[PDB]
Amino acid sequence: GRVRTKTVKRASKVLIERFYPKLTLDFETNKRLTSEIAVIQSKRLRNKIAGYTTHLMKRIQKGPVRGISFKLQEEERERKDQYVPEVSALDLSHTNGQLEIDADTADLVKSLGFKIPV
Amino acid sequence: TRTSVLADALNAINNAEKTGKRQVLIRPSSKVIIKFLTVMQKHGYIGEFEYIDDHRSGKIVVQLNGRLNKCGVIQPRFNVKINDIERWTDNLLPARQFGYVILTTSAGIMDHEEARRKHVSGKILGFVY
Amino acid sequence: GKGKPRGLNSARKLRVHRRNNRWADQAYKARLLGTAFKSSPFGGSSHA
Amino acid sequence: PKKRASNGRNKKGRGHVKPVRCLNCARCVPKDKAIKRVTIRNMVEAAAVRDLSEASVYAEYALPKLYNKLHYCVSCAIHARIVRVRSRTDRKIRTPPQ
Amino acid sequence: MENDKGQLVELYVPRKCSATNRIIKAKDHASVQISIAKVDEDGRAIAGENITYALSGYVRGRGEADDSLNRLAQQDGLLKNVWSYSR
Amino acid sequence: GWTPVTKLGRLVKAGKITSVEQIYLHSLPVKEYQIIDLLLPDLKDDVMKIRSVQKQTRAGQRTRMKAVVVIGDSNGHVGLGIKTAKEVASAIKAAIVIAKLSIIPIRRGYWGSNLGQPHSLPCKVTGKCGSVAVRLIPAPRGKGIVASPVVKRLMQLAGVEDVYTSSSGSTRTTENTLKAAFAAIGNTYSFLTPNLWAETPLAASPLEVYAEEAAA
Amino acid sequence: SLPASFDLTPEDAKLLLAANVHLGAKNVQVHNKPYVYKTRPDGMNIINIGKTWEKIVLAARIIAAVPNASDVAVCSSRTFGQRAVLKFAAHTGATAIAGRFTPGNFTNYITRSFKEPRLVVVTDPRTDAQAIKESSYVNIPVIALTDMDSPSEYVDVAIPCNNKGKHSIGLIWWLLAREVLRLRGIIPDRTTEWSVMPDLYFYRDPEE
Amino acid sequence: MRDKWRKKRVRRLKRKRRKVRARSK
RNA sequence: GAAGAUGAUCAGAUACCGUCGUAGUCUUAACCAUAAACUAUGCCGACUAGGGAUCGGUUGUUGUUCUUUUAUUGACGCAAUCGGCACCUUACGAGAAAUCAAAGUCUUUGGGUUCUGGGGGGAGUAUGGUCGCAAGGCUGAAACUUAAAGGAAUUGACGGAAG
């Protein structure tokens, strides 16, 4: 089996959080990048970390990944976060000024001193 | 069968009190129950209470104010001489400074301090503290 | 409740019930059967 | 200790339940305690369905099913894995499995 | 509690439940003390002026805390026609 | 050389919260023992029992040491602590820490007349743990502490002078006896008496009037 | 008491009613019978909207009385309510807890995200039972959005609503945040329109 | 001995004492 | 199908397994009176918390199927209620725990009342009495002996247990 242990996986996640923009989908470029960025004590571990980083970067491009977060994805999901629809879903224009509430709710409405149209 | 209406009344009071209720229903009523409740109310352990006529034994609603720790009957109604009130007070009450043993004397139903003032004794009926 | 009579006029029942059940107490039963007097090697003395 | 609140059977509010004989060993087990399984099976194995369809003198003949209710004692039920020993908290689950 | 000279020989006169009048024990960590903001006619909560209630861990654990607060708040005018006395 | 991790610890390192009665009055959790050392400088602890507990393993028994510690200022505050550790010394230190974290107020009272300071309990309190139930009765002023030595030591550390005691169940189980006695003596401020019938205003929490000083 | 301005206003009744907030569960707890206006003969339970408003204003007042807004923890584990609590913490200055609640947040005082709220607000007592339980361990009042079937254990102030609807949860949190801002003085007064739409605080599926 | 089979042994033992002593009433 | 006979198995099996088979199994008249005859939980009475089902009775009420097109058809559906067999959650409370809606309202110890126990054995034995056709039932000791026996749970180990 070839399950990658916690050390390589955590190191890959840290690398992607910190240095996502300067990191690509190729193993050789990521190998040199890991060599310059990370102080890895062995070349075998360096290659394993570079390869797993390549795997994660290759997965990300198709869609987000749990655990990982870099300061471009968070900005874009914040921009999507602050979205205010110009027309409101609770604006009563969607039924043309009327409620569809059943008669029991209509008597609730009356009994609170309101005469809003149904 | 029902053997002591006072026992049922005081048990219902305790079970309402421990659950945090502020009111409790009592059935049946009796003169002894009303006198015991009046002794309790005089010392502040219960609020007001209201008797409900039903052309029968009656019902009572009692108001509870959270000061009651326990009330209960002593069954049998043991005969108590004057010099034996002290052992009942030692046995039944939490401390010497508060709480009451409730007696039925030929002078009427009273707490043991009123009994000591009038120098009377009868049968033991209950307690409250 | 509690399975013993509580009545004010129940003294005979309580006294006889206690009398019956002390026989299960080995010390009391030995004393009232007179076992030390009739079956002990020393006949109930301290020395022999 | 008491292992089950239901005593390992299903008798509340009656005195006696007549027995049934275990299918496997013919032991007498009370009907409420017996492990019971309702089975409806195709009379022909699914392999021979096409052979018997080809050989039929009829066209569109609905093949009959086998109906049987099976009764087991506890020993044979456990031995043949109709039921299994469960954990202390899992024993309380009474809904059928999936 | 106090002595013959009247001296209050008593540390820590403890709090009592607003709903049941029970004493709030020192290690009753399920008990809470609500503070509620006074509102003026202008509609702005007055600073540092609060109406406060205390509930025992018992009343809260029994699920009666919401009803007890309804009762207390409506009896102080913090609330109208939500709590009915007659059920 | 201590830095608090909770708001109460921060308020106690500052001179804002000065008495543990403030903590008790608002039923505040106490998760740092430096608070108790700071607001109760005079505390005496007694190690009451040391037990050896064993867990069976494939290779043999695993033995751990269990220590019960009682702590008190002999002036109305008392605490109980039990903890297990591989060595006796570490178990004792940890039990002292947990005993300090559990200090409670004890209500002293009078038997009869209120002459002098309170000398006994104000009512009858019972506590129960396991099979052991410990009952504490107010005693007249000349009586010692009429109790077994473990319960007696707990009574002395709480500051009680005159008390009667009754025990039932398996009292030789020292831990359960001490927990029952600790529970009973701690019920002296749960028993409502007529002199406590008077309503008191709900004082603001020391975490409200010191919201800034409790931040960080 | 409370001036007549604080009454339930018709545009609020519009907003509340269009969201099916008044839709309660089939069955109702005994403690929540006061909140049931009446039962539609389908089986649903109508909720008194006026009492909902009263409890919203009450909860807003309790949230306002906390001297430090950061000590007011708002919680949601349901998918439909994390956006709402995130926006509530954004506008009011509260500390939010969205998604999984880590057991030990209130009781384990060495966990990194250890917090000691003065007050806790919860979207659902069923789905956020852990927050309520730990708050019971450490003397913290709870304000909960409660449906007709929501448990009442260790809840101080219940806000009757439909805490199972997508629109209702966001609506309730929006109303709470608006009332809090009004009471503090951020919003100048009680008639002016707020800068924020109720659409903000509404959850969304991820593919829009 | 599975308490049941001890009782059956005393049953048989007691049954034989009933016959030894019947020789003499 | 006890007994018995007999074939296997087995070191031996007068056992389990196979084949027979007497009493018995059934019934009518009489006896016998015992079971893990168990919920191992006396009976009467009051009170204390949430929930959905279900059987019997009664009382108000349909987008339902059906007499017949409809009533006083019937079934089903929706609500209340008294009684019952139970169940689920909780644990305020109880408990050594397992667990318990009673096994709660019990050192804050008293509603009425019956029965039973007092370390383990000897022993439900001996003896006397009594009931029975008998088998046995009921009542029921002592000498002597002994430091534990026992309950519930924990960790391990083991299992011709399971995964």
Ligand SMILES: CN[C@@H]1[C@@H](O)[C@@H](O[C@@H]2[C@@H](O)[C@H](O[C@H]3O[C@H]([C@@H](C)O)[C@@H](O)[C@H](O)[C@H]3N)[C@@H](N)C[C@H]2N)OC[C@]1(C)O
């Ligand atoms: C031979 N041992 C006996 C033992 O059999 C038993 O004796 C009872 C005895 O207590 C009963 O009798 C007892 O109780 C009755 C009660 C009903 O009123 C009293 O009248 C009677 O005086 C009293 N001894 C008696 N009816 C039967 C004996 N086997 O208990 C006492 C004992 C001495 O240990």
Ligand SMILES: [Zn+2]
């Ligand atoms: Zn079988």
